[PDB]
Design a binder for this molecule. Structure first.
Ligand SMILES: CCCCCCCCCCCCO[C@@H]1O[C@H](CO)[C@@H](O[C@H]2O[C@H](CO)[C@@H](O)[C@H](O)[C@H]2O)[C@H](O)[C@H]1O
Ligand code: NI
Lengths: 50, 149, 50, 89, 46, 50
């Protein structure tokens, strides 16, 4: 940002990719954790037993 | 999505514009569609309200009215799932179609919730015994109404 | 068919919720656009002799 | 009415009357729920209201006449399809 | 959110109004269907 | 709930409603009695609206 005007930037390749997402693990392990909290009870038929 | 890409493609440009030069959007289809879906979503919510009012006004109990209310969202979003799996989009037409869908579907729920109510109101048997009995006299109707429809 | 669920109250909740996540995901993943394409696709050749 | 016919011991007329009397309310619950479900679309204006009006005023008129009027006529159809052409044996 | 208050007021007011009308319609129709109660069918199918 | 009660003995507006509804019901039923004695004209009035 501290360079002459008219100069800008962009990321490519690996850099470009890491932009889309690098870490979704905490989201999809979270949904893993809820679909697990409930799918077990789909047999234990129990509150909190899972 | 294309327009969404176009504001992106273009959002990177302004910092290197010369002095005095500014963008402007004289013809734009999108906010029509943002609004078209805003309006239907709001009709849907207020419909869910109105259903819950006719439910209270008829079963006269806070508890009873939770049942058919909960069952509607499950149906309607459930539809996104299945029409996603047939390659259909959440468009003007489709999204608009499901309001009618909400309308039809609500009673699929209530006919049975009610029928159980009315059955327990004379032989006076618990919710289990009554709802089971209720399934016995109707459940067969529900598949066929659905088939013929 | 229904009775099975009458005895098994939660498992229904599991069916419903799985459908709740399926649909709630199905918005976030599906394309949003006014019009499902409705015209004969057409290609257009274009020339210019000055 | 049919269930009262076979699964219980009944002829048509009295069966119909009991079905229709037991069944009357639900019809209104549904139709009131429904007609009111669609309320916004018919009342709606602006914001590209062309569609939801055309859909709602279509389903509404057809919802009243299919309720206020059909609860009277259904019984006659179900009787006439039997009373005038049934298995006497 | 504010449109929701509008929704609630229309809702509460309207639920009875429409309700009455549809009952009014069967109540009325019932009376006119009472007046005009017909003789029966014809013997041709038999 | 009780066996046989249709909520008439209930506090407030709600009872009024249940009574006038149950009334609307008797009316309607006693009216379908009349209609059902008169199968024919109805079949052909049905024709006029068809
Ligand atoms: C899995 C994909 C396929 C889905 C479609 C499968 C069809 C069967 C659905 C399972 C539900 C049971 O389906 C069952 O069918 C028979 C067929 O008359 C009905 O048996 C019948 O009972 C009495 C008279 O016999 C009447 O109410 C009615 O004539 C009919 O329902 C049951 O009431 C219905 O519950
Ligand atoms: Ni009487």
């Amino acid at each position: 940002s501290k360079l002459p005007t008219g100069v800008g930037y962009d990321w490519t390749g690996m850099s470009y990719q890491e932009r889309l997402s690098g870490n979704q693990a905490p989201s999809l392990y979270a949904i893993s954790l809820i679909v697990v909290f409930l799918c077990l009870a789909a047999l234990y038929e129990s509150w909190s037993i899972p | 999505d294309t327009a969404a890409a176009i504001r992106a493609e273009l959002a990177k440009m302004e910092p290197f514009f010369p002095s005095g030069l500014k963008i402007v959007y004289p013809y734009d289809t999108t906010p029509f569609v943002k609004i078209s879906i805003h309006e239907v979503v709001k009709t849907l919510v207020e419909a869910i309200i109105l259903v819950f009012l006719v439910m209270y006004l008829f079963l006269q109990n806070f508890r009873a009215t939770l049942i058919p209310t909960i069952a509607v969202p499950v149906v309607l979003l459930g539809t996104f799932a299945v029409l996603a799996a047939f390659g259909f989009s959440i468009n003007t037409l489709t999204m608009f179609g499901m309001v009618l869908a909400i309308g039809l579907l609500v009673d699929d729920a209530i006919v049975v919730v009610e029928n159980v109510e009315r059955v327990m109101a004379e032989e006076g048997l618990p919710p289990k015994e009554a709802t089971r009995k209720s399934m016995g006299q109707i459940q067969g109707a529900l598949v066929g109404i659905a088939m013929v429809l | 068919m229904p009775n099975f669920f009458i005895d098994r109250p939660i498992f229904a909740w599991v069916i419903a919720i799985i459908i709740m996540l399926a649909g709630g995901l199905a918005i976030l993943k599906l394309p949003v656009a006014q019009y499902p394409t409705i015209a004969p696709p057409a290609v257009t050749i274009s020339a210019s002799y000055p | 009415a049919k269930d009262l016919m076979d699964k219980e011991g009944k002829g048509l007329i009295e069966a119909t009357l009991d079905a229709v009397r037991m069944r009357l309310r639900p019809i209104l619950m549904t139709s009131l729920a429904f007609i009111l479900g669609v309320m916004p679309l018919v009342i709606s204006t602006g914001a590209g209201s062309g569609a939801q009006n055309a859909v709602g005023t279509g389903v509404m008129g057809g919802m009243v006449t299919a309720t206020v009027l059909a609860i009277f006529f259904v019984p006659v159809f179900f009787v006439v399809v039997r009373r005038r052409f049934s298995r006497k044996n | 959110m504010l449109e929701l208050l509008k929704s609630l007021v229309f809702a509460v007011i309207m639920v009875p109004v429409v309700m009455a009308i549809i009952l009014g319609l069967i109540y009325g129709l019932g009376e006119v269907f009472n007046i005009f109660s017909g003789v029966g069918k014809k013997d041709q199918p038999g | 709930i009780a066996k046989g009660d249709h909520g008439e003995g209930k506090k407030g507006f709600f009872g009024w409603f249940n009574r006038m509804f149950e009334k609307s019901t008797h009316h309607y039923t006693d009216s379908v009695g009349g209609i059902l004695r008169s199968t024919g004209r109805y079949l052909v009035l049905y024709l006029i609206i068809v």
